Write a protein that binds this ligand. Structure first.
Ligand SMILES: CN(C)C(=O)c1cccc(-c2cn(C)c(=O)c3[nH]ccc23)c1
Length: 126
């Protein structure tokens, strides 16, 4: 049928910021995940039309993807690291909620999440 509008990657009314933690999220965390062999299905919003998932956006009401996260980081959309971490967690959780356990897309998300947790374990202070 139709996809929703994608999550915003900028907003004129939302205060913008750069912190060293946000810089680390973009240059270390996002970059490491983006190049992973399993990253590509997560590099843009789920196209429920092209993927023939007519119920995807009936079930997933807070969609999130790494393409959106990357642009948010590039645009200084976030005020703090927690906002960005929340977006990553939402992306993984959506995949686990929508898809059958043990599906390939779930295994891909699980591998990306393990790597994500490894990199955020070293998030610098401040
Ligand atoms: C063979 N693959 C993995 C694909 O053609 C492809 C491509 C683009 C996106 C997605 C996809 C992403 N996400 C996050 C899902 O939860 C999901 N469920 C079913 C498909 C997807 C799958």
């Amino acid at each position: 049928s139709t996809n929703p509008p994608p999550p915003e990657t900028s907003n004129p009314n939302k205060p913008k910021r750069q912190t060293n933690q946000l810089q680390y999220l973009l240059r270390v965390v996002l970059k490491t995940l983006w190049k992973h062999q399993f990253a590509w299905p997560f590099q843009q919003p789920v196209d429920a039309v092209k993927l023939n998932l007519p119920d995807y956006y009936k079930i997933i009401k807070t969609p999130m993807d790494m393409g959106t996260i990357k642009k948010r980081l590039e645009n200084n959309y976030y005020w703090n690291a927690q906002e960005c971490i929340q977006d990553f967690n939402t992306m993984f959780t959506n995949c686990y909620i929508y898809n059958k356990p043990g599906d390939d897309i779930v295994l891909m998300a699980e591998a990306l999440e393990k790597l994500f947790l490894q990199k955020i374990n070293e998030l610098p202070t401040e």
